[PDB]
Coordinates of C-alpha atoms and ligand atoms in Angstrom, one line a residue:
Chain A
X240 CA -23.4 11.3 11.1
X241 CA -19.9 12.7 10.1
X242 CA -21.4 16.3 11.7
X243 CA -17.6 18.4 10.8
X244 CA -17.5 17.1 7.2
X245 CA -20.5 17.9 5.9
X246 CA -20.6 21.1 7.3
X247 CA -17.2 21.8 5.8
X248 CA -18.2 20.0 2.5
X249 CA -20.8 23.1 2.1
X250 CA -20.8 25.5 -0.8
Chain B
X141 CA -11.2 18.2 -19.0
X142 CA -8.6 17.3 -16.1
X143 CA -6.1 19.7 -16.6
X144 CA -2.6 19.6 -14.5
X145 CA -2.6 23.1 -14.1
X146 CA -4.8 23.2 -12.5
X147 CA -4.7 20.1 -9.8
X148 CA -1.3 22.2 -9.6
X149 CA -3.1 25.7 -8.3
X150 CA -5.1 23.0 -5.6
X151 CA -1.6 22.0 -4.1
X152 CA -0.4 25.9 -3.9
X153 CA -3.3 27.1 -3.1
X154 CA -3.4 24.5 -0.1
X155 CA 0.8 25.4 1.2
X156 CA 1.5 26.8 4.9
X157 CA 6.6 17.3 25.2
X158 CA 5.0 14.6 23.3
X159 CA 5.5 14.3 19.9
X160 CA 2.5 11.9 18.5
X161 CA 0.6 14.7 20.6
X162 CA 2.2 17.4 18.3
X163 CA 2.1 15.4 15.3
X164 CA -1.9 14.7 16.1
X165 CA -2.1 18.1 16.2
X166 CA -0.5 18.8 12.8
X167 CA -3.0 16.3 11.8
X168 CA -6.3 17.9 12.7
X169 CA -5.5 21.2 11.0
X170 CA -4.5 19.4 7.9
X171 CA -8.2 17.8 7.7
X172 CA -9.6 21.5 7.5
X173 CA -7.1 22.3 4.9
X174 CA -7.5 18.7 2.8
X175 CA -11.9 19.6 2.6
X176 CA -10.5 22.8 0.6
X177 CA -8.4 20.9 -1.4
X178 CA -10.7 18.5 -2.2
X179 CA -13.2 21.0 -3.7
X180 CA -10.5 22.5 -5.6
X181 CA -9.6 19.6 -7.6
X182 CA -12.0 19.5 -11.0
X183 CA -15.3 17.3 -10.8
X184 CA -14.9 16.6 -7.2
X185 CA -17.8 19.4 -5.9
X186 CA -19.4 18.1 -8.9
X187 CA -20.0 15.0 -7.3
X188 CA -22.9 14.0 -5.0
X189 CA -22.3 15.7 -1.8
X190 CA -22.7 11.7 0.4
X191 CA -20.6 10.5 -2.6
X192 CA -17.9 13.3 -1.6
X193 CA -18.1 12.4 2.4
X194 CA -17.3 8.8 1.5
X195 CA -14.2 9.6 -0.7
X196 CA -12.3 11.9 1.8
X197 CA -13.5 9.7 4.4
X198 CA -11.8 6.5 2.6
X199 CA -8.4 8.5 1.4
X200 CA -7.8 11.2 4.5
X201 CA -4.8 9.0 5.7
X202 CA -2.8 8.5 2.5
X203 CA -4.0 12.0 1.0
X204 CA -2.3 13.5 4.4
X205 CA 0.2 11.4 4.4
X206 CA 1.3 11.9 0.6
X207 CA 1.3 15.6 1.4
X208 CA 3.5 15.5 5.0
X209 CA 6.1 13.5 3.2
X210 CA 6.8 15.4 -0.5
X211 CA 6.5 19.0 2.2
X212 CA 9.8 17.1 4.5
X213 CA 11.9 16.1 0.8
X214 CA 15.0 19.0 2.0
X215 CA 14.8 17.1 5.3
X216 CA 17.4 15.2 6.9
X217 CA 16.5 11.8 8.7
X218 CA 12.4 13.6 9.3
X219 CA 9.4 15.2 8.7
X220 CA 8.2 19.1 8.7
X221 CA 4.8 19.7 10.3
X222 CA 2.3 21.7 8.8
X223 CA 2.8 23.2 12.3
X224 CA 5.5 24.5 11.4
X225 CA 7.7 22.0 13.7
X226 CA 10.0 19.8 12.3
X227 CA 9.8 15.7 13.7
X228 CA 13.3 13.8 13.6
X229 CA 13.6 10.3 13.3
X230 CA 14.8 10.2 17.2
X231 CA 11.8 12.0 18.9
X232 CA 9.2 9.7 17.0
X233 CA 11.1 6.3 18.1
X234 CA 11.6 7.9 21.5
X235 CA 7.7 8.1 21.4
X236 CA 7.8 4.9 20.8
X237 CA 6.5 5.2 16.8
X238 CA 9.6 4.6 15.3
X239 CA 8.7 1.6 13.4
X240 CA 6.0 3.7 11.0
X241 CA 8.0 6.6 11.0
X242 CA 11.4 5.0 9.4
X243 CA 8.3 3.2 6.9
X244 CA 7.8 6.7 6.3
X245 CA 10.8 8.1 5.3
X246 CA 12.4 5.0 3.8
X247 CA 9.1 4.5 1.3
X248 CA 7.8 7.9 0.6
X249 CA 10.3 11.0 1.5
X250 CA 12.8 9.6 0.5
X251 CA 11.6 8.0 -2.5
X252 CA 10.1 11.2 -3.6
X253 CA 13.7 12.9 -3.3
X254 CA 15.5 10.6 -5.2
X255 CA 13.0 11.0 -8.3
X256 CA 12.4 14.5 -7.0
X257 CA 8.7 14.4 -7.4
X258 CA 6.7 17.8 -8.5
X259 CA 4.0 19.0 -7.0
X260 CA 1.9 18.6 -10.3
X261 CA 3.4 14.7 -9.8
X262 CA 2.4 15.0 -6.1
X263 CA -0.8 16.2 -7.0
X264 CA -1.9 13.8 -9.5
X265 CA -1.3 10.8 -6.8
X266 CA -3.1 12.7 -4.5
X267 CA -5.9 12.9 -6.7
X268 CA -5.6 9.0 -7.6
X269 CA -5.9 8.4 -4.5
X270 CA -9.0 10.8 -3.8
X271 CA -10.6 9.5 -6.8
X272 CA -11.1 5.6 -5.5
X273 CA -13.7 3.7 -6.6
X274 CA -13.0 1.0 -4.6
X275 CA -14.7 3.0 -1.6
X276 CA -17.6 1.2 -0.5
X277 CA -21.0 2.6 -0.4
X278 CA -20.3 4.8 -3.5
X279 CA -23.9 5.4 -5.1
X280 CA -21.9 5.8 -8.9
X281 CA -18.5 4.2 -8.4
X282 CA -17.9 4.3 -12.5
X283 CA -18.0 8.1 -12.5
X284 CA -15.2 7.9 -9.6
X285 CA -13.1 5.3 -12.1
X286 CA -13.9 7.6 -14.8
X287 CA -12.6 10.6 -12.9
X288 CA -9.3 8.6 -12.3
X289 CA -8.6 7.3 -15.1
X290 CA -8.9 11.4 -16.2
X291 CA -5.8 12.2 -13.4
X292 CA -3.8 9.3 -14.6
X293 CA -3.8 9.9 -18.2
X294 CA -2.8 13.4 -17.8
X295 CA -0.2 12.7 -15.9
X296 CA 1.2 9.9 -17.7
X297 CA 0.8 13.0 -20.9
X298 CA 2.6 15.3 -18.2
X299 CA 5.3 13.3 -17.7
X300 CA 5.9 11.7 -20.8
X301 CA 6.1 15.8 -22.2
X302 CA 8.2 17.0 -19.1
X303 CA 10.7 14.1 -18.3
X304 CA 10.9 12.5 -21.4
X305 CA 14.3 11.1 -20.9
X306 CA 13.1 8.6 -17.7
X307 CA 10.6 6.8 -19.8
X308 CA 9.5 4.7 -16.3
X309 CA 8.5 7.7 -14.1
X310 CA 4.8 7.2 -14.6
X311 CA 5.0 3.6 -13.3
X312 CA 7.7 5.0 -10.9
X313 CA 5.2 7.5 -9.5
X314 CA 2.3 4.7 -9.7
X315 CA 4.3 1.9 -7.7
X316 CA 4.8 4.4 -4.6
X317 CA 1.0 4.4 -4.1
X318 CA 0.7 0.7 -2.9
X319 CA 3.3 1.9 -0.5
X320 CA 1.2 5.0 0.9
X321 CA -1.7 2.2 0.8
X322 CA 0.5 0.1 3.6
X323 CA 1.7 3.0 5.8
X324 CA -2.5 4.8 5.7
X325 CA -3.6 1.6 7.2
X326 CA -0.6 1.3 9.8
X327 CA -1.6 5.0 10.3
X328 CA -5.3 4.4 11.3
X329 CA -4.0 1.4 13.8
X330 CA -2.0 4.1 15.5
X331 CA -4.7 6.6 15.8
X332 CA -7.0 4.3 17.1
X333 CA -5.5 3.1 19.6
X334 CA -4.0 6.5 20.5
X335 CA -7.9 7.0 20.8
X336 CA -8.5 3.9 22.9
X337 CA -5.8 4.6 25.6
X338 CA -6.6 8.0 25.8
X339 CA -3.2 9.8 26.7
X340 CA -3.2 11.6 23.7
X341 CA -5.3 14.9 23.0
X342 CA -6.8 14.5 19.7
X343 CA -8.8 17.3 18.2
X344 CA -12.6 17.3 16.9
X345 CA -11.9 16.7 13.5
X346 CA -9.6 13.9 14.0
X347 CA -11.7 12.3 16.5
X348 CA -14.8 12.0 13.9
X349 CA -12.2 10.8 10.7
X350 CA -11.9 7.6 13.7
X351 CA -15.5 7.4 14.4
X352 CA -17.1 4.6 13.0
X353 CA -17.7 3.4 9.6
Chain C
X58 CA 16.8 -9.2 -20.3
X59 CA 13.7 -9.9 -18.3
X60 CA 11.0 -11.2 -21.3
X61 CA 7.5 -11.4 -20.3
X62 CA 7.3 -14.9 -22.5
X63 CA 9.2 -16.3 -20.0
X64 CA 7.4 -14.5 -17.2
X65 CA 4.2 -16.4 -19.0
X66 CA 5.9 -19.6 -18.4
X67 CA 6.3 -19.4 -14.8
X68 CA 2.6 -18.9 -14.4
X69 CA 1.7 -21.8 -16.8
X70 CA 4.2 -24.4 -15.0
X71 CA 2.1 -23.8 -12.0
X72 CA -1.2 -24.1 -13.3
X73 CA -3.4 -27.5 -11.4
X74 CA -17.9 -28.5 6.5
X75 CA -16.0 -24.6 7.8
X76 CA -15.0 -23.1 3.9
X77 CA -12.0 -21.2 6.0
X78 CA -11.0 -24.3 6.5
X79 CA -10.8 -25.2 3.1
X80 CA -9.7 -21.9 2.0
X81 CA -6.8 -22.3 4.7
X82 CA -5.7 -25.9 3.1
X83 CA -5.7 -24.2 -0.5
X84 CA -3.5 -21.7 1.0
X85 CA -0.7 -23.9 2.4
X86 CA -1.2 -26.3 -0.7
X87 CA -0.3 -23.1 -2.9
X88 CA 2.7 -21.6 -0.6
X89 CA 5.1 -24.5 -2.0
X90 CA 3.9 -23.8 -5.3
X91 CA 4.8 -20.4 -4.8
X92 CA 8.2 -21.3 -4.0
X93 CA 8.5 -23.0 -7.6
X94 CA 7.1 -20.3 -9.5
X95 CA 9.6 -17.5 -7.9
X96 CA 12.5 -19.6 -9.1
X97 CA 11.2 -19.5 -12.6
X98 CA 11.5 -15.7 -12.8
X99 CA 14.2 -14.5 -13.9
X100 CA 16.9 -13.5 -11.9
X101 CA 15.2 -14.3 -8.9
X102 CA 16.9 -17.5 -7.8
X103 CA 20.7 -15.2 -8.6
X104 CA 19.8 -13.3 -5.2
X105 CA 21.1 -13.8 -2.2
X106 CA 19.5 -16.9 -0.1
X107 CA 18.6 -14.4 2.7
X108 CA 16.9 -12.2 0.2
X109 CA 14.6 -14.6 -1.5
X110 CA 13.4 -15.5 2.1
X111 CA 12.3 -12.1 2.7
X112 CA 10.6 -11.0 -0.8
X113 CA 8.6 -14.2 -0.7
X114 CA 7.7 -13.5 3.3
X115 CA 7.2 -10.1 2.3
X116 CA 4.7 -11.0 -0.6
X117 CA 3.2 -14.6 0.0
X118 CA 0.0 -12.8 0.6
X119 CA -0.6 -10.6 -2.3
X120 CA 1.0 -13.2 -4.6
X121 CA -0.9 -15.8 -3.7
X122 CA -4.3 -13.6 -3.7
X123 CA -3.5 -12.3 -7.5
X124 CA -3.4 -16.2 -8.3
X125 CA -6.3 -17.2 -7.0
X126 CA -8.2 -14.0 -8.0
X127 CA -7.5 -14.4 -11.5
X128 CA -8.3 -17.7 -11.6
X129 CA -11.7 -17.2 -10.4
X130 CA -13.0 -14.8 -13.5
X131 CA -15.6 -16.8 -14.8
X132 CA -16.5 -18.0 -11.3
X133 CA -20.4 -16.1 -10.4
X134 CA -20.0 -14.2 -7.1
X135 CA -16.9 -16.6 -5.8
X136 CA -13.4 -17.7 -6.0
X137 CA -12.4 -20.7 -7.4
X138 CA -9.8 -22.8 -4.5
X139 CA -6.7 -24.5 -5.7
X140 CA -7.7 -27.9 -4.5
X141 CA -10.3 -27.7 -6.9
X142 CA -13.1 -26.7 -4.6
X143 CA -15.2 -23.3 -5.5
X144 CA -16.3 -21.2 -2.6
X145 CA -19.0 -18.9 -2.8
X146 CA -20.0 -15.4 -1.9
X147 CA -22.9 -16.8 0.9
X148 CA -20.4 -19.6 2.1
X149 CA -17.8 -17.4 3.0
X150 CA -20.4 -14.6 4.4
X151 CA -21.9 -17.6 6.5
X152 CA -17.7 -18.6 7.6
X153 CA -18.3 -14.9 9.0
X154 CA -15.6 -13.4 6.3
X155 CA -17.6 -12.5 4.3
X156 CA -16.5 -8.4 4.4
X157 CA -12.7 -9.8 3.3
X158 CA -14.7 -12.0 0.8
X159 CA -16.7 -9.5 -0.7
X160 CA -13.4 -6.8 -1.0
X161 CA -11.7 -9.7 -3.1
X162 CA -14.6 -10.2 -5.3
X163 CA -15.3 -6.6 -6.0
X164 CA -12.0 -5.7 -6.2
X165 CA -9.8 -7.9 -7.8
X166 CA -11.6 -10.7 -9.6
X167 CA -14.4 -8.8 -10.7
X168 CA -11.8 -5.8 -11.8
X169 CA -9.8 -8.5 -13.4
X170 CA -12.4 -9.8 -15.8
X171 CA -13.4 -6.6 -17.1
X172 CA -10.2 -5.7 -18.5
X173 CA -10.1 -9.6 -19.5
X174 CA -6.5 -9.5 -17.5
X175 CA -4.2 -12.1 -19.3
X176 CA -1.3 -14.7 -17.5
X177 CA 1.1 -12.3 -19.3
X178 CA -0.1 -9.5 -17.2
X179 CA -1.0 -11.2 -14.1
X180 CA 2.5 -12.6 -13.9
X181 CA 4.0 -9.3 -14.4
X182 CA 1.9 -7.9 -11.7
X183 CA 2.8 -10.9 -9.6
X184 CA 6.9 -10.1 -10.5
X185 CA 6.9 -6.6 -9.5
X186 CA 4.9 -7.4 -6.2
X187 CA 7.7 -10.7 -6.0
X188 CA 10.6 -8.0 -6.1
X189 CA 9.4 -5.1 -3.3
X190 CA 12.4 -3.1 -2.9
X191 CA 10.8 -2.0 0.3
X192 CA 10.7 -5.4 2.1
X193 CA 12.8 -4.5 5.6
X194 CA 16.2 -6.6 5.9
X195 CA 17.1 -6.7 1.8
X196 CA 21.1 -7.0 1.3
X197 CA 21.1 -5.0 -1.3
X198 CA 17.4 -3.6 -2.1
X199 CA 18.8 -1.3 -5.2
X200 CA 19.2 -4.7 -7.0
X201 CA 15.8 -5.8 -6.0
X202 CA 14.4 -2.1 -6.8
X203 CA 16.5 -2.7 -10.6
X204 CA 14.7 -6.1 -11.0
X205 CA 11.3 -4.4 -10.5
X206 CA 12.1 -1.6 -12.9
X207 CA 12.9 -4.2 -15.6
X208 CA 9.7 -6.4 -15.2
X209 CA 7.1 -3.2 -15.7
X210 CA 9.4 -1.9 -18.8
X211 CA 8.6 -5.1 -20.3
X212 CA 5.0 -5.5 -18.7
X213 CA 4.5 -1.4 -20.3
X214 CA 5.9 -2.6 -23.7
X215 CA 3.7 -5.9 -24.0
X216 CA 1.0 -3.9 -23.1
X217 CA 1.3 -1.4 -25.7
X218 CA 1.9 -3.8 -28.3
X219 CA -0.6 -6.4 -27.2
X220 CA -3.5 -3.8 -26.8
X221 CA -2.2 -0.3 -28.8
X222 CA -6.5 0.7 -28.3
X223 CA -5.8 0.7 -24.9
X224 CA -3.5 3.6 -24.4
X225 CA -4.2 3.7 -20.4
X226 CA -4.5 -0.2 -19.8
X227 CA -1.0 -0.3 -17.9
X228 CA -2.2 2.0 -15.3
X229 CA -4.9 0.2 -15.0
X230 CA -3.5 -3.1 -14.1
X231 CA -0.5 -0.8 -11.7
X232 CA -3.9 0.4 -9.9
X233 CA -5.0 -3.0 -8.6
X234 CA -1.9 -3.3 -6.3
X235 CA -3.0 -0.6 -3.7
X236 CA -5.9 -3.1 -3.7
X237 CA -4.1 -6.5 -3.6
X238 CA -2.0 -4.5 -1.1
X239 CA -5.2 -3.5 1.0
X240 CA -6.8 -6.6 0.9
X241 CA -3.3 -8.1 1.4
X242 CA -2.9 -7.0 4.9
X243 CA -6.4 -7.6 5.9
X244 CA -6.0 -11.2 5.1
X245 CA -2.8 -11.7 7.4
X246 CA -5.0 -10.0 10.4
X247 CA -7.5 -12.8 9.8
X248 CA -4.6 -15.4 9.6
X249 CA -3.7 -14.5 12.8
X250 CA -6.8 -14.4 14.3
X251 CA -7.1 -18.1 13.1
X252 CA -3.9 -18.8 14.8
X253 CA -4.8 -17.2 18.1
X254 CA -8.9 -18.5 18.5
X255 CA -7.0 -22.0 17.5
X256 CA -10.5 -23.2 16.0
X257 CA -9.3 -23.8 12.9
X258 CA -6.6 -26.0 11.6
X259 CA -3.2 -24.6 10.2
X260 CA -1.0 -26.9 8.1
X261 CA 2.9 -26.3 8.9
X262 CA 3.8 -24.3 5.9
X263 CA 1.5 -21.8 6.5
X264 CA 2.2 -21.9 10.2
X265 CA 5.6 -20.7 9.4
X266 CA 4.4 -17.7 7.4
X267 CA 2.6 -16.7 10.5
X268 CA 5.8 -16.8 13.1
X269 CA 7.3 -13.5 13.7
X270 CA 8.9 -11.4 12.1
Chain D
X23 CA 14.3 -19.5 11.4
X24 CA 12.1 -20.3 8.5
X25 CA 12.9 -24.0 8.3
X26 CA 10.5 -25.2 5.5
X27 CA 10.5 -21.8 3.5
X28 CA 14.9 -22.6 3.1
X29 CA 14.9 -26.3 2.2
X30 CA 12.5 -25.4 -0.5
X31 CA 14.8 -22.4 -1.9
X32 CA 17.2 -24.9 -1.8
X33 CA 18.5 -25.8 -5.3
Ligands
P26_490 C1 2.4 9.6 15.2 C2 2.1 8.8 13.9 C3 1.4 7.5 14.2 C4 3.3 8.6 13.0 C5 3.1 9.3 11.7 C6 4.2 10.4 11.4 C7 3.1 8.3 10.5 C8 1.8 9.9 11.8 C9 1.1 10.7 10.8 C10 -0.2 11.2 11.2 C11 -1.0 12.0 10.1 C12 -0.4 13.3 9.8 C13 0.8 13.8 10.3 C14 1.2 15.1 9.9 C15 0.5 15.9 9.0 C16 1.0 17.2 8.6 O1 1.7 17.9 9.4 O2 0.7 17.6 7.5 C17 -0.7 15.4 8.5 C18 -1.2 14.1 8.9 O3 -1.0 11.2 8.9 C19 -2.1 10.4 9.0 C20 -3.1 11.3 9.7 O4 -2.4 12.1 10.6 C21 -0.8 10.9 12.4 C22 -0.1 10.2 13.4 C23 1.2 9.7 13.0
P26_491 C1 -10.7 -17.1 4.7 C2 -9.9 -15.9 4.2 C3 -9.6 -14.9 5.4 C4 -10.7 -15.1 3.2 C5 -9.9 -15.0 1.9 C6 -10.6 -15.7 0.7 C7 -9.6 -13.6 1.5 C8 -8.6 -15.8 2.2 C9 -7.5 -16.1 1.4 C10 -6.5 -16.8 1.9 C11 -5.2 -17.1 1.1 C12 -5.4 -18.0 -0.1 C13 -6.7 -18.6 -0.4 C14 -6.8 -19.4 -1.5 C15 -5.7 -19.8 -2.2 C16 -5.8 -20.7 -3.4 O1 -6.7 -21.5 -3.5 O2 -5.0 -20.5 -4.4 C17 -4.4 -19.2 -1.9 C18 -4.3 -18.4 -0.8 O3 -4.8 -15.9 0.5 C19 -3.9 -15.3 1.5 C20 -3.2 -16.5 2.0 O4 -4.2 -17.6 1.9 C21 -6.5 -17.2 3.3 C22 -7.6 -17.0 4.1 C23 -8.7 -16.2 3.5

């Protein structure tokens, strides 16, 4: 869903 | 186990025509910047990586906010974007925001300057405030309490050790959230109906923080 | 100066087929009790005329929510109304309210009777949300920001004499007024929303809370 | 303005 977060929220 | 020292080292490790368009844009790179922050701050990448997206998705707005207002304390009658560009009181009512902007510097900037409110101090909210276990959808909300009620007792042990002549700044520091709590929500009214009308470029970031839930 | 015994006694003098309706009624009912109990706190009724008007306008909400919040603690998923009627979790979630409903419960009562909150506390609670220094208008809002000061010293000091096992129970009552604050504002958007639609009746006092500004 | 809120401040 929240595609910019999660992707930021990695490692 | 939640040292000040080192929620300290997350806030310095975090420091940098149409206003609202400019001030949007501040915003936006801020969100980038807050994700880095958030992982800095002790037990947070601990946590469940869904349990993470629902905290900063709650808090972005007063975790921002907190941090715009404590960077603009040396600032007369405004606010210094993380742009670099100062905001005056003025330009935001000319954009026709002066209503939240005066809540802004009446309730938190100038609030904080009066006190003159640390960074360890303006840390410690911001973790409060990142910390809430009131978010819904939380899979373990007590771990979230727990967490806080980590921040809060070292800073109340933070102050009481490093002002302990104003014997109130604890609850001082405390009472200025409820405030921040108020001007988020205003916030999010603004930016959504910035969104709805359309007249105002708002990055990618921004735009998914006002997606829905 | 400003004793939390006679705090206490403010709060005990004021002891008593749609359920938003009924909640609506209980509401109005409770807004001239209101108006009683600010005059029993101290120092409350020595303030300017003007100024009472605009810390109770300021606060009816949250003051009256903390009331009826507290009340409800051994009430099982539900709130129990000041006309004597109980409301339940499924009644207001059938009223479609039930998110507002739910945000109460979870909260605020719920968060209440874990801590076993006493009248002592919630009174406190109820004085320092009575006397916002940032309510918009205030003569003289250092005096009101003085008078808040005063009632956590003492709520701080009762609390670490009262429960001395407890070392971080004072935050922990502070931290519900983000929350009353929240939930605060969400209510007067569903007040209004009442008012406009027009399908539900409002009694005059509460009317008048509802008329700008 | 607030006509029932200031005849109950009253005394
Ligand atoms: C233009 C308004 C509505 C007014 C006001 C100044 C209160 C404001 C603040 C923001 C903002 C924000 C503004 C500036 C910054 C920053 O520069 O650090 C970060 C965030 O706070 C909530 C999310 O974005 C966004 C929009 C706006
Ligand atoms: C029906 C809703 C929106 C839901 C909810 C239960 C949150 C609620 C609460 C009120 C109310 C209220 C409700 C009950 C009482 C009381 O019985 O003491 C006092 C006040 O709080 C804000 C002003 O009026 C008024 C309306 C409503």
């Amino acid at each position: 869903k929240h595609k910019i977060l999660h992707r930021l929220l990695q490692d | 186990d939640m040292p000040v020292e080192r929620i300290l080292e997350a806030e310095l490790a975090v420091e940098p025509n149409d206003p609202v368009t400019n001030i949007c844009q501040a915003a936006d790179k801020q969100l980038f910047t807050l994700v880095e922050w958030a992982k800095r701050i002790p037990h947070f990448s601990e946590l469940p990586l869904d349990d993470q997206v629902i905290l900063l998705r709650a808090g972005w707005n007063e975790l921002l906010i907190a941090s715009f207002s404590h960077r603009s304390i040396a600032v007369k009658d405004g606010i210094l974007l993380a742009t670099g560009l100062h905001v005056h009181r003025n330009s935001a009512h000319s954009a026709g925001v002066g209503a939240i902007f005066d809540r802004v510097l009446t309730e938190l900037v100038s609030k904080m300057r009066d006190m003159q409110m640390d960074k360890t101090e303006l840390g410690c909210l911001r973790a409060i405030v990142l910390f809430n276990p009131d978010s819904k959808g939380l899979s373990n909300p007590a771990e979230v309490e727990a967490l806080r009620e980590k921040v809060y007792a070292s800073l109340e042990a933070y102050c009481k050790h490093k002002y302990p002549e104003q014997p109130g700044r604890f609850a001082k520091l405390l009472l200025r959230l409820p405030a921040l709590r108020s001007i988020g929500l205003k916030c999010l009214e603004h930016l959504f109906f910035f969104k709805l009308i359309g007249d105002t470029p708002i990055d990618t970031f921004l735009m998914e923080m006002l997606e829905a839930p």
